[PDB]
Design a protein around this nucleic acid. Structure first.
Ligand SMILES: COc1ccc2ncc(C#N)c(CCN3CCC(NCc4cc5c(cn4)OCS5)CC3)c2c1
Lengths: 718, 719
DNA sequence: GCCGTAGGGCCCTACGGCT
DNA sequence: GCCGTAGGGCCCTACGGCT
């Protein structure tokens, strides 16, 4: 797969390790054929710190680098017989590019150690944006720097900001004239200072020990601050190996945390999800209108909101639509959206999809100045930092995904429960954990099934950590003539039916369990979930069954770990703080959704007041306009001689003729007097903290009766 | 393996489906009665076992797979008692490629599996390809023809809710178990065999290697209209002659391939895929002034609206259109790694962005003033265009090079100032001859430039539609000292892999089948043009080796012309003159109806302003007349009876804003009122005189020749 | 191992006309 | 065994908490 140059002189010869063949495209085009070589890798590479001796060598890419440098490794190294005297590390400039760097560097160190020291290893720096302002072009290398500048350029003659998710996305000359041309390039030399301090740093971030890694996050983080970026960064183009690993790994881990794996506490959506649901609402794809194809929403959410490859956007939009994964689906689906047998939905190309009615409630009131918008990834479009979520989607559905130094897992809850539960907290602020558990009995799943005890549920709700045991629903039925058989008709959340059956059949071939004649899956669309275990003559099933809960996954544990995002930060929280934050949302939403309904009833009546005057001094107005000539001077004639403002003169001249009927004069005073009542219901909702929190209560009772459904998981007490 | 079997292991009750791929082979696992119904996904088209050498099929992956699941053996060792299903259902997606797939399956079945068909084992399920809905009524339908019939057989006062079904993935497992797999409702067809020699006659004919025989076939059972062609009675039994399934399925497919996939219309020189991309670029305001948009965004847009087939071919075609070494005049704009001469494709949709070239606007010029014809799309939710206003001879400009069924096209790109000069010559003299046109149109003009040998090949091409041209890489010979020399290649023959080309060269040298050479270096780079180097062994002869290479490699390669296109709906082989007249004809009409449109809307705007003239001059009496009108219906039937104003007049009067009762805005009217009565004039003239119009068309093709007119690249060595 | 967002990229196959 | 539209699809990797 390697692409080499013409030369065979190690001194001047070099090599750019790139992400892929896609990015390594622009690379082979803008290079100098005589002296620069390219090596296409594949995505993230094996973090050699964690994996073993035999498996580190069987890695195909690690061998293509070994061969290419032609040195061997460990103690059979030989820096004498090296093909290139410059190993450049050119990874895409976005965050994931840096996590690559760190792996490559990791590898370089533990095997090709003497190479970093002799200064042969290097780091390339390709841009990640290109702001334009006339003849002015700027090159910013990460989201943080773009914040700064996007606010330093007072002038504002309009910008056209680019952005370069890959290397494949640059013209093959932008990538010579910013990254490869040995007369402009800011190539950074990898130098080794303090070998004892490297070995701690590697162990910290590439080492198995998860804790020290997390510590290291809360130690070095920086959340909402623009005051960062400071400063000098010495005008020399070398970099300390530690000074960089330390940085680039964190620039990564922070990103994976604030906007990737974990949910906001209000809406409860990781960013990919929140974007999809918005991108649906935008393009109009609502529940009343036809299904729209899936590569039309996935290609449209990519190019408008969310800069990452499809097999992430789609496989995510999918779950949101499944009834076995989302307790309350947010996406209605047409097509093969996959099964509980581990098989996955049919490709983007086939399936169609829209909103569910319940996802309109997340977006209710979103265009009405409630939540805040941040510019998308390229300054062309306007997107949401969070949605008005008029239900606690965080709990209601609950998410779970792996980050760095921390992971999360939150079970889904019944909504009538969650709402009866929040209504009680707005009544009583001082509420106790145990009291809330009268309304909110605990996890309600999609899959149904059973939970064995509040001993592990109570633990979770109180702290945020607790093991919950899950047992499937199973009947011991008989079929006459002497024999019994088992029937499972509900299963544990997140369990591969067909993978389980295998681990059951496995223990039978291997005689690790006795009394089973045959195994069978009889599940099908009309008989719901149904797995049948044929059991031997009489030998008591109750013991094999109570053996099946033990050995296999007919019984497993939800390891809870409630870690959401509160005010931009990864805070581990409990049942109560989840509701206090989510209700603070509703309180704030419904608040601004009144300051908005207010300033509009205000200017509309500001309008109407000029409308009523032009009616009863009518023929005075007409000969006032007709005498006038231009539109610049027709504003003047009515602002002076009738005492009317500007937004009251324009909306008078802009008015049509059909309004001059004798019926609309008496329809205005009655629409105007529908306003003075409507404004009276606003100003005494702002000066009254209580009538508004009352109103929130009113809307959420509505949300509960319209959508709120029955329990699925039965809790077996004791 | 790869096979999801069923519970019961008793053949005579157990059936296995064969679906196209895992995607729709899971809309099935989720529909099935896992007790008796077994699924085996394939993986798209499986090989055509007639066009195949025996030892190959015994090494194909999805054939060894079916043999196992049946469990019967093949040919001479085929045993029928050993079968594990007594119903092998062919169940492939509803579309036209599931048609093709179906013929390749039966063809295999018939070749080695004959005994299996012959005892009523092989069946054929019928999955819907549509689902129109008029309130209560849910009708299904299984091809595009059957749908046109039904869209003219309904009193459309319900308004349709048509839904398509690209595959089985697009189907919820219930509405597929129902319609297609339920022993209660389902309508499987049993595969019977009649005259064995009349079967064997359709297999070596349809799925054979006799290209002529198969085209003839097409030309005979054609149908293109198709008006309202035959029905009845489809014998109310669920049987089906094999020798008939080959004929309609294969034909009904080669039909779709030919008229709407792999062959270019003549009026705009575009396959349907292309037309679809460029239209969709036009729909999103993705013109050359606004920014580049991510590839996924367009391709995902074009696919859900216009072209229901894979991204992989929508993209790769969108790429060919944007790269300067294939499209002589690129119609798309490249921002990214959009490939190289070396045979290396672009970067997945998520990387690259794009928009229209300026030249593409000419194609899509006037597409909105009613000039070309607007059809429905594949799901009847929206409008798409049948063909573009193509304001330049795109077919010949850029050409095309696609493979249909039974036939194949190949047209080379031409220089554009040549083409319009050639078209202008035709407009002045309907009878102008081939030779006379070849004084403007010297020959093919490539993006790789280079040379051609003679016109005796060019000339056969243009006068019939067939002919063979020879293509010469632009070589040159130079010295590097002292005494020794070397050969430099600045341009290469349109459409060869400059890397495999070099590779080939190297091969003849590593195995000693050509003498003279010593070193071979590729030295092309972005900044310094194309350039490939050969080192001469001193004293040896350079002209001899350069000639030797032309023969023994793709240094000298040949483009055989085959000018086949879609004329008036059908595959016609055409010459240079025909290609121009039809295109000119198109250009004549496109203009004629633009003019018509402008005029209708010029009179519609004129009757408006006319009632706005009774309105302003008579401004006063209307005040008194509206201040008395109460309702809205009474304020209309007033100014109709008192000022002879139509309904669109008393209307566009109640529609009026008071800000126009100002002083200067009584002249804005008359000033452009007269300008309009005079503008109406300019158009009726164009419409009444055939030549006045035709002259206008001339000056518009001229306008365009000066803007996008550019030098020739390919040179024409005389011989 | 396995979950869920994210990096990354390769093979079969049909079809016609040509060395 | 290649030109270009079309059918179809599977695999390596990181990251953290738990059997
Ligand atoms: C599917 O099974 C295999 C087997 C081997 C492979 N080897 C190399 C590669 C690659 N690259 C793929 C990728 C194939 N897939 C990757 C995902 C692509 N995604 C489709 C898609 C659709 C749209 C889109 C982007 N991608 O934007 C708007 S609509 C389709 C090709 C393979 C896939």
């Amino acid at each position: 797969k390697l692409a080499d140059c013409s030369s065979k002189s190690p001194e001047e010869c070099e090599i750019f390790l790139v992400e892929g063949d896609s990015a390594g495209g622009s690379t082979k085009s803008g290079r100098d054929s005589r002296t620069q070589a390219i090596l296409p890798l594949r995505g993230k590479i094996l973090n050699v710190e964690k994996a073993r001796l035999d498996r580190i060598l069987n890695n195909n890419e690690i061998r293509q680098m070994i061969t290419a440098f032609g040195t061997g490794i460990g103690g059979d190294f030989d820096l004498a017989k090296a093909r290139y005297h410059k190993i450049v590390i050119m990874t895409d400039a976005d965050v994931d590019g840096a996590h690559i760097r760190t792996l490559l560097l990791t590898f370089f160190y533990r095997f090709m150690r003497p190479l970093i020291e002799a200064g042969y290893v290097y780091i390339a720096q390709p841009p990640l944006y290109k702001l334009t302002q006339g003849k002015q072009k700027y090159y910013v290398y990460n989201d943080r720097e773009l914040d700064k500048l996007k606010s330093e350029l007072n002038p504002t003659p309009k910008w056209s900001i680019a952005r370069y998710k890959g290397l494949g996305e640059m013209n093959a000359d932008q990538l010579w004239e910013t990254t490869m041309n040995p007369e402009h390039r800011a190539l950074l030399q990898v130098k080794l200072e303090d070998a004892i301090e490297a070995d701690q740093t590697f162990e910290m971030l590439m080492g198995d020990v998860v804790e020290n890694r997390r510590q290291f996050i809360e130690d070095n983080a920086v959340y909402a601050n623009l005051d960062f970026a400071e400063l000098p960064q010495s005008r020399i183009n070398e970099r300390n190996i530690t000074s960089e690993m330390r940085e680039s790994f964190l620039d990564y881990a922070m990103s994976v945390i604030v906007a990737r794996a974990l949910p906001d506490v209000r809406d409860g959506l990781k960013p990919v999800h929140r974007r999809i649901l918005y991108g649906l609402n935008e393009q109009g794809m609502t529940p009343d209108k036809s299904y729209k194809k899936s590569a039309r929403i996935v290609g449209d959410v990519m190019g408008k909101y969310h800069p990452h490859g499809d097999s992430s956007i789609y496989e995510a939009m999918v779950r949101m639509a499944q009834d076995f994964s989302y307790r309350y689906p947010l996406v209605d689906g047409q097509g093969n959206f996959g099964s509980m047998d581990g098989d996955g939905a049919a490709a983007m190309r086939f399936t169609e999809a829209r909103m569910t009615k319940i996802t309109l409630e997340l977006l209710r009131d979103i265009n009405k100045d409630t939540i805040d918008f941040i510019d998308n990834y390229d300054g062309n479009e306007r997107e949401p930092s969070v949605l008005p979520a008029r239900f606690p989607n965080l709990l209601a559905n609950g998410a779970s995904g792996i980050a760095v130094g921390m992971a999360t897992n939150i079970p889904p809850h019944n909504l009538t429960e969650l709402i009866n539960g929040v209504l009680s907290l707005s009544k009583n602020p001082d509420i106790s954990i145990a009291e809330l558990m009268e309304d909110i009995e605990g996890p309600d799943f999609p899959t149904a099934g059973l939970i064995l005890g509040k001993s592990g549920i109570r633990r979770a709700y109180e702290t945020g950590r607790g093991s919950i045991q899950m047992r499937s629903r199973a009947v011991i039925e008989e079929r006459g003539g002497g024999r019994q058989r088992i029937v499972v008709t509900e299963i544990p959340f997140q369990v591969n039916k067909a993978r389980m059956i295998e681990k059951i059949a496995e223990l039978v071939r291997d005689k690790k369990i006795d009394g089973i004649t045959d195994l069978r899956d009889e599940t099908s669309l009309r008989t719901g979930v149904r797995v049948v275990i044929d059991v031997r003559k009489d030998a008591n099933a109750s013991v094999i069954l109570n053996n099946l809960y033990k050995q296999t996954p007919l019984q497993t544990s939800f390891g809870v770990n409630m870690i959401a995002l509160v005010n931009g930060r990864p805070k581990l929280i409990n049942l109560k703080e989840a509701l206090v934050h989510y209700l603070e949302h509703q309180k704030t939403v419904v608040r601004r959704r009144t300051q908005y309904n207010l300033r509009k009833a205000k200017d509309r009546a500001h309008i109407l007041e000029g409308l009523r005057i032009a009616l009863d001094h009518i023929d005075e107005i007409i000969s006032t306009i007709r005498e006038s000539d231009t539109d610049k001077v027709a504003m003047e004639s009515l602002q002076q001689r009738f005492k009317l403002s500007e937004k009251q003169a324009q909306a008078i001249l802009d008015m049509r003729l059909r309004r001059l009927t004798g019926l609309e004069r008496d329809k205005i005073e009655a629409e105007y007097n529908e306003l003075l009542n409507y404004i009276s219901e606003l100003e005494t909702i702002l000066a009254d903290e209580e009538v508004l929190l009352q109103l929130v209560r009113d809307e959420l009772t509505e949300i509960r009766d319209r959508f709120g459904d029955d329990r699925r998981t039965e809790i077996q007490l004791g």
